[model samples]
Target: YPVIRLNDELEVREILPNAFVITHKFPWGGNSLVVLIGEKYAVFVDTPYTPEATENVLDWINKQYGNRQFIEINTGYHVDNLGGNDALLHRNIPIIGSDKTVSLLRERGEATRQLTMGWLEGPGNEKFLKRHETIPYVGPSQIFQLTEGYHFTVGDEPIEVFFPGETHAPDNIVVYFPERKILFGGCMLRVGNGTGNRADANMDTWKSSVERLRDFDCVAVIPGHGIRFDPGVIENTISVLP
Candidate 1:
């Protein structure tokens, strides 16, 4: 995959024919956003943490694909997932997520905001605060609250947005693209050496969620914060369950 570096802070790579992984590195952690470019439009799995970065991505998409419509699906309500909601919505792009995800955003969005603020306010980070202040707590514009067997399509590709049981967060969802054979496990499925343990984690349920996720057939698996891999990564996560 060729590396498309926007700058020292970000890198975009084409992992599939029309699928690109946008990565942004902060002092705290790595954030990955998956973008699937369709014949007529594009869909973003998540957006960057700050408005400036989000705008840069928007510009890149436009420059590469012209003025095609864009949509977004936030895997969860965490600051990293929905942080660019406001900016994306401002550009008239419809953002979608699970109903529980929208509710969590309304309920706990402020806490996530403060968490990011806390990170920036940490020692030696003050110099970078001004560029990040423009970000706001914007929720999803569209919500998906469906029962079992419900799925939505991106252009002609069918995608399933099913609840893989509760895992990292209360509203975490797994986006499975059957035709493309890609399962975007979001924050729920951790790749590489990540244990997926966090203050918001539910260990037993998370394990069960992994069990369900493993049932879905996919050639490529994209994790939340780390690298992408094959189905064996689920076993890697299951093996380290504590």
Candidate 2:
């Protein structure tokens, strides 16, 4: 099965030949995790929140290629994005995010953890509570403060992490795969039918950010939670901007 479904219709599907997207529906909505397969390593855009699902994703990756090193990039500092950070650290995977994300985590990570714990124990989160047992509220291990752009590699595969002036979150960042022309828009870019969750978003600067994104040569765009779409998704975002 290309799409592996778990609790809440969670799935893992190949969006590109060597790139896969894993999703899990949470109390808020669906959470997306993008994984790029490389020759000797694997990289992830975000990670699953609950420990059970987190481990399942890792298990799937390990099963595919255990010897390969793993790297995960966080789009923002939200729990749905960075919840599996500790898991990566435990497994010795490099969990990377923006410097602003680190500051936010340092400021509110513990409080957010408590809040999430209470939420998890409340409602619409029974499965996650039962499976995870407890949450691992931690921050990313590696961080970069990208003003305009920064380029790096995951075992020689090129990746461009861009800070397009903050749309979804102050620390939000997008991953651009130059080779594949695949843009991991994270929560920065979404569809009209989407949840439109913007708890930490800056509507004032969101339009400019989307405009910044349009400058890329993209074949496909991946949102934080949904199927892949064409580059026009950028224009779709602009249409709703304030």
Candidate 3:
């Protein structure tokens, strides 16, 4: 696939027609998604790690495709997923996430920023940490509390947000695009043998939570911190769980 570098910390790769994966190489290699629903709306699966990076992305999207309504769907409450929410909020974009995700952010979003700052306090990281420090705690504007999941559509594309109990976090959710056959697994789906972060993890139920993803017919599965993979990675994620 062709990859375009938006800056030192961001790169964009077109995975499918009108569907792009924006990878941010910063505190960690995290993947955020952009799906253009016709010419009317653009849906963002997650945000870059900070508002500046997300603004760069937003600018690039507008430069490339003209102005379109923006909608953001967060898979979890971590900074890596929603840290750029302030930028979206500035534009009045509707940000959507599970009720648990929204509440968790409302409760711990400030602490998460401080924790992230500590993570970036090593030598030679002063500048990056400074940029991270300015990010404020912003939660989703639209909240949904449903085990059966939330469904919505932008143009003709159907998007589904499913909560499979709890895995990586109490509020972690997965976004599925049925027409595109793509699943944004976020941090809940393991990429290798290692579980990425367990600070907010529910180890006992993680496996069963991932098992529920089998209900969808996904051809492309996008992990939170790695490249996109096949649906077989779902089983791999299940196997890696304790």
lDDT-wise, the better of 1 and 2 is 2
Give candidate 3 regions above 4 Å deviation.
Answer: 146-148
lDDT of 2 by residue, 10-98 (tens): 57877677677777665554455555455567778877775556777778767765655788888888777877777778888888887
Question: What CA RMSD would you report for each candidate?
Answer: 2.3, 2.8, 1.4
Lowest summed lDDT over 10 consecutive residues: which window, candidate 3? 140-149
Q: Encode model 3's per-residue lDDT on 1-242: one tens digit a residue.
A: 88899888899998888888889877678888998888878999989988888999999998899888999999899988998899999999999988888778878788777877888899988887988888776888998884657999888778998888888989888899999999999888877799976888999999998998998898788888877567888988998998
TM-score of 2: 0.86
Could you give candidate 1's per-residue lDDT for residues 1-242 as a string of tens digits?
Answer: 68899987777877777777777665434455555556467778777776567778878878887765787888888866766777787799988887887788788777666666666886778755544555676777777772352377777778777887778887888777788887777787766666644756887788887888768888877777765556776777776665
- Order by TM-score, highest first: 3, 1, 2
Model 1 bad stretches (over 4 Å):
127-134, 146-150
Pairs clashing in candidate 2? none
Q: How many backbone clashes does candidate 1 have?
A: 0
Listed in order, each prediction's TM-score against the native is 0.88, 0.86, 0.95
